[PDB]
């Protein structure tokens, strides 16, 4: 704390008294010098701690306000944060069935109900283009979620039944394409 007038006064008094004492002198001069020195020393010493307490208190207050602002900010982005985190962990898991269904949904082939686990029960998906049908459906079997399923019904956007033999490269582009395959889980 060397930026206060009290420090300047105390330093000048210290220098004057020290020089006078080192020069050598009587008792009355020493007494007068110390009576004029100690008041300035106390004046300096009070502020020397008051300033420190003020500075640390200000630092703590700024810390607390930063923490409050950050918490208020954080509690307002939870949906996006959670979605990003979930997909990061889904990457890190690295499973074949999960990767299969995520890529299928990313290209457009999403399911319509909860995927069953038993050797029975119906599953319905939507196939929006011929390329997805070429990749997944070949023959009369269906490969989805790293499993095997058996096609039993095909329905178009007009809800008319389409037989499996109908679908072909050039024979397809005269149809309502968002097909709906309903299959059951092969053993």
């Amino acid at each position: 704390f060397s930026s206060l007038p009290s420090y300047a006064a105390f330093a000048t008094a210290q220098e004057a008294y020290e020089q006078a004492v080192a020069n050598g002198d009587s008792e009355v001069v020493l007494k007068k010098l110390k009576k004029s020195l100690n008041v300035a020393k106390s004046e300096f010493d009070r502020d020397a701690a008051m300033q420190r307490k003020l500075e640390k208190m200000a630092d703590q207050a700024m810390t607390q306000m930063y923490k409050q602002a950050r918490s208020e900010d954080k509690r307002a982005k939870v949906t996006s944060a959670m979605q990003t985190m979930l997909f990061t962990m889904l990457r890190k898991l690295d499973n074949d069935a999960l990767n299969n269904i995520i890529n299928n949904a990313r290209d457009g082939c999403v399911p319509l109900n909860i995927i069953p686990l038993t050797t029975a029960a119906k599953l319905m998906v939507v196939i929006p283009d011929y390329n997805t049908y070429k990749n997944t459906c070949d023959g009369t079997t269906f490969t989805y979620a790293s499993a095997l399923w058996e096609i039993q019904q095909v329905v178009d956007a007009d809800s008319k039944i389409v037989q499996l033999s109908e679908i072909s490269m050039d024979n397809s582009p005269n149809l309502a394409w968002p097909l709906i395959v309903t299959a059951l889980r092969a053993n």
Binding site: V78, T79, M82, Q83, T84, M85, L86, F87, T88, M89, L90, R91, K92, L93, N95, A97, L98, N99, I101, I102, N103, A105, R106, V110, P111, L112, N113, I114, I115, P116, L117, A145
Partner: protein, 78 residues
């Protein structure tokens, strides 16, 4: 380490599903809660994975909900 990862992922997935107002359909919410509670009690890492597939199918079969493609282009899921 392959089991705690799937349990944490299941917790995060259930949180994400709850954020999308899924508990406004009692049957779907009951099924999701049952699956989530069953994953955390698993002991082997195959039943947990099939239940995880079943639970993720719920989120995937909601058209508007989220953007699968944007969330896959952010140096995220492949």
């Amino acid at each position: 380490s392959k089991m705690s990862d799937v349990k944490c992922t299941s917790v995060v997935l259930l949180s994400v599903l709850q954020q999308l107002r899924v508990e406004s359909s009692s049957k779907l919410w009951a099924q999701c809660v049952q699956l989530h509670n069953d994953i955390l009690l698993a002991k082997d890492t195959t039943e947990a994975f099939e239940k995880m597939v079943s639970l993720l199918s719920v989120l995937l079969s909601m058209q508007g909900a989220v953007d699968i493609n944007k969330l896959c282009e952010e140096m995220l899921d492949n």
